[PDB]
From a paper:
EcoKMcrA from Escherichia coli restricts CpG methylated or hydroxymethylated DNA, and may act as a barrier against host DNA. The enzyme consists of a novel N-terminal specificity domain that we term NEco, and a C-terminal catalytic HNH domain. We determined the crystal structures of NEco in complex with fully modified DNA containing three variants of the Y5mCGR EcoKMcrA target sequence: C5mCGG, T5mCGA and T5hmCGA. The structures show that monomeric NEco has two separate pockets for (hydroxy)methyl groups on cytosines, reachable without nucleotide flipping, and reveal the mechanistic basis for the Y5(h)mCGR sequence specificity of EcoKMcrA.
The purified NEco was co-crystallized with 10mer dsDNA with the central C5mCGG, T5mCGA and T5hmCGA sequences. The protein potently restricts methylated and hydroxymethylated DNA (from the glucosyltransferase deficient T4gt or T6gt phage), but not glucosyl-hydroxymethylated DNA (from wild-type T4 phage). However, the enzyme is also effective against hydroxymethylated DNA (unless it is further glucosylated). The structure with T5hmCGA DNA readily explains this observation. In both proximal and distal strands, the hydroxymethyl groups are accommodated in the respective pockets and form direct hydrogen bonds with the protein backbone. A hydroxymethyl group is also tolerated in this position, and donates a hydrogen bond to the main chain carbonyl of G34. We also find that NEco has a significant (∼40-fold) preference for fully methylated over fully hydroxymethylated DNA, and intermediate affinity to hybrid methylated/hydroxymethylated DNA. Nevertheless, the remaining affinity to fully hydroxymethylated DNA must be sufficient for restriction. The protein-DNA complexes in the three NEco structures are highly similar (all atom rmsd between 0.3 and 0.9 Å).
Residue numbers in the entry: -1 to 143
Write the structure that this text describes.
DNA sequence: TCATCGATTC
DNA sequence: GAATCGATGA
């Protein structure tokens, strides 16, 4: 029912994902980590996704908060975009440091809206879009390794 | 039963 | 500041 991200040696990570169109945006959904060991490889999987996107010649993405709570309470897609600008930049740092910046933006969301001060979980259900990519085969090669 | 993120530990 | 745990309400 769910696809998974695979590591560099072809081993399945504990990181459920899906490829398709959600709220009019085509890309990769990374499922949330929790409770306990549910999708506990979230951060490792996201580091791999960022590394492979960069290796594939992708420099910028758009990332939306896609939790059931935020989809319900925040109707505006532009408000669900986690980063302030049009795009999030993947180049100019290690995949881990890019990932830390990306996931820091998740801390600005509550169940019902934005916070002024960031706090809490940074391993939420997210939708990652590559502008001009509408094909599952591109995303299949990112999560496969 | 379940994904949610606040809360706690790192 | 960030990884992990686990109380919570649907």
């Amino acid at each position: 029912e769910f696809m998974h991200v695979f590591d560099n040696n072809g081993i399945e990570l504990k990181a459920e994902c899906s490829i398709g169109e959600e709220d009019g945006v085509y890309g990769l959904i990374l499922e949330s980590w929790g409770p306990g060991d549910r999708n506990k490889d979230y951060n490792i999987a996201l580091d791999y996704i960022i590394e492979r996107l960069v290796d594939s010649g992708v420099s910028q993405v758009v990332v939306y908060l896609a939790s059931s709570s935020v989809r319900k309470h925040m109707h505006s897609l532009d408000e669900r975009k986690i980063h302030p600008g049009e795009y999030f930049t993947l180049i100019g740092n290690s995949p881990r440091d890019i990932r830390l910046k990306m996931c820091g933006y998740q801390a600005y969301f509550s169940r019902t809206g934005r916070k002024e001060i960031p706090s809490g979980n940074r391993t939420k259900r997210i939708l990652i879009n590559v502008p001009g990519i509408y094909s599952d085969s591109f995303w299949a090669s990112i999560i496969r390794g």
